[PDB]
Every structure is written in C-alpha cells, then in structure tokens.
Design an enzyme around this catalytic site. Structure first.
Site, PDB file in Angstrom:
ATOM      1  N   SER A  39     -66.681 -12.350 -36.117  1.00 63.93           N
ATOM      2  CA  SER A  39     -66.594 -13.761 -35.750  1.00 63.93           C
ATOM      3  C   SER A  39     -67.722 -14.618 -36.284  1.00 63.93           C
ATOM      4  O   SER A  39     -67.728 -15.820 -36.046  1.00 63.93           O
ATOM      5  CB  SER A  39     -66.506 -13.920 -34.232  1.00 63.93           C
ATOM      6  OG  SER A  39     -65.860 -12.799 -33.637  1.00 63.93           O
ATOM      7  N   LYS A 201     -74.051 -18.596 -33.901  1.00 62.76           N
ATOM      8  CA  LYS A 201     -72.663 -18.241 -33.778  1.00 62.76           C
ATOM      9  C   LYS A 201     -72.648 -16.715 -33.781  1.00 62.76           C
ATOM     10  O   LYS A 201     -73.177 -16.101 -34.711  1.00 62.76           O
ATOM     11  CB  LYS A 201     -71.849 -18.792 -34.941  1.00 62.76           C
ATOM     12  CG  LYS A 201     -70.471 -18.187 -35.055  1.00 62.76           C
ATOM     13  CD  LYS A 201     -69.578 -18.757 -34.010  1.00 62.76           C
ATOM     14  CE  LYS A 201     -68.342 -17.920 -33.963  1.00 62.76           C
ATOM     15  NZ  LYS A 201     -68.094 -17.532 -32.563  1.00 62.76           N
ATOM     16  N   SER A 202     -72.114 -16.112 -32.712  1.00 64.24           N
ATOM     17  CA  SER A 202     -72.022 -14.652 -32.599  1.00 64.24           C
ATOM     18  C   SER A 202     -70.759 -14.017 -33.199  1.00 64.24           C
ATOM     19  O   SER A 202     -69.953 -14.674 -33.859  1.00 64.24           O
ATOM     20  CB  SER A 202     -72.127 -14.244 -31.149  1.00 64.24           C
ATOM     21  OG  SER A 202     -71.412 -15.169 -30.375  1.00 64.24           O
ATOM     22  N   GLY A 203     -70.620 -12.722 -32.975  1.00 67.63           N
ATOM     23  CA  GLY A 203     -69.501 -11.999 -33.495  1.00 67.63           C
ATOM     24  C   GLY A 203     -69.560 -10.596 -32.958  1.00 67.63           C
ATOM     25  O   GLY A 203     -70.618 -10.130 -32.511  1.00 67.63           O
TER      26      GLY A 203
END
EC number: 3.5.2.6
Length: 257
Positions: A39, A201-203
C-alpha cells in the site's frame, strides 16, 4: 541503537533509505534489498495523477461501476453506480487505503503501463509494479513482482513529491492527507520526537510480516523534509509483524540528522 541490533532484536529484515533534501545526506541499510512496497504505492499513484490534473480540476467526476470494486474499499463500495470526484478518490485511497479508489486512480492515469513509464522517466528502473490490488498484498521472496528497493522507492518519492512538478496546492493537498493519516501512528510517527512533523503512508503485504512506512519528516526547525523509507519483513510467510520495529528504526535513523 544499531539497525543490525534491531534486526536481531526483532528477528526481522530492515531496509532503510533516508535523505535530507537540504544537505543531501543519505542514511542507508539494506537499501538495495527488495521488499514488497504494498500500500505504499498508493502515494506514488496519487502523485502521478496530481502531476496531470490541476488542483482546480480535481472536482472532476468519474463513474463507479460494479466491475470496478475490489476488496477492502471501505469508501468506494458506497459508490457503486454513482459518480465520485477525483479529489474524493485520492482522499479514500490515501486516508482509508481504499483499493477501488487506488485502482480507479491507476485507471485515470492510464494503467500500469503508464505508471511504469513515469517511473522509468524518473530513472526508477527498480520499482517493479505488476499487479493492482488486493493481489498487491501477496508477497514472495521467490519473486520481485511488486517489490522495490528502499533506495529506488526513496529516490522516486523525492523526485515526484519533494521536488517534482506538483503545483503548490496539489502538493499541499497530498501532504496534508499524509500528515493526518492515523493509520501511520504506530510507525515512523511513533519513532521521531514530538517537534518533528511526519507526512506518511503505510503498507502491509499479507505474507512474511511485510510491514512498511514511507514518510516526509520535517525536522523541528527546517522546511526541507527528510525523505524516510522503511521496508521490513520476516522469514515466515505466516509471520505477524510488529510496528515497534519501524517505530524504533525511525528513532535510530533520526539520530543521524
């Protein structure tokens, strides 16, 4: 603390690429080892759409058809058979990590082929996007499809966002979504001091405890951001990850700037 001591402490693998855009100072650790970006690519896709749609044309709408819907689309599911603006697509993708939104944004840009081209143009011959989502969550050490190296993803992020073609408004629009993203709180946002500002922004892939966070950290008393990309993962496909591994990596890496 050592990054390598951290690998041992957590029994994970750490990929870190950091760059202070003011001095040009870079920290690296396994920066050329491939990991699934997952992501985190939602921020690359959003940014590419923003390079070609002025902020004032963001009110443009598009139609959401049922064949558009992919798993984990907490926002777009409500839009089947409705029109949705480009702005709202970006917000759902960025803020709720919506998969339909991201797929649609990829559609607006022109598909993977188009995305892959921008990257090459960015000199990013590493980041290798093959699938969309939620299939973008399956990760395997055997393959490099949907993987990138911490340095590659890092250089790309810097050139698209930190210093690219985004107008002031679009850049403010995007970063703001990253500053207010709550999903990133247990990560880098957790490892830097209180005075630092973090736009992230993570994932998370679904295999090998593949957990990542990428960010624009603003030093207490600086305008230029430090671009920090942290990709991590474990040895077992079924390994659960620990966000504290990233929280701590951030603390370490920050001692260098």
């Amino acid at each position: 603390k050592e990054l390598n001591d951290l690998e041992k402490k957590y029994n994970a693998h750490i990929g870190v690429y950091a760059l202070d855009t003011k001095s040009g100072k870079e920290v690296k650790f396994n920066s050329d080892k491939r990991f699934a970006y997952a992501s985190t690519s939602k921020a690359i896709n959003s940014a590419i759409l923003l390079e070609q749609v002025p902020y004032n044309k963001l009110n443009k709408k598009v139609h959401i058809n049922k064949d558009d819907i992919v798993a984990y689309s907490p926002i777009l599911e409500k839009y089947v058979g409705k029109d949705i603006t480009l702005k709202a697509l970006i917000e759902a993708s960025m803020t709720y990590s919506d998969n339909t939104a991201n797929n649609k944004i990829i559609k607006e840009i022109g598909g993977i082929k188009k995305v892959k081209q921008r990257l090459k143009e960015l000199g990013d011959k590493v980041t290798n996007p093959v699938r969309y989502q939620i299939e973008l969550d399956y990760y395997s050490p055997k393959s490099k499809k949907d993987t990138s190296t911490p340095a590659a993803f890092g250089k790309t992020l810097n050139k698209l966002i930190a210093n690219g073609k985004l107008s002031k408004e679009n850049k403010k629009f995007l970063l703001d979504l990253m500053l207010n993203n709550k999903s990133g709180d247990t990560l880098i946002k957790d490892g830097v001091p209180k005075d630092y500002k973090v736009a992230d922004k993570s994932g998370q892939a679904i295999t090998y405890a593949s957990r990542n966070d990428v960010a624009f950290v603003y030093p207490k008393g600086q305008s230029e951001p430090i671009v920090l990309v942290i990709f991590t993962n474990k040895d077992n496909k079924s390994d659960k990850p620990n966000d504290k591994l990233i929280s701590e990596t951030a603390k370490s890496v920050m001692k260098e700037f």
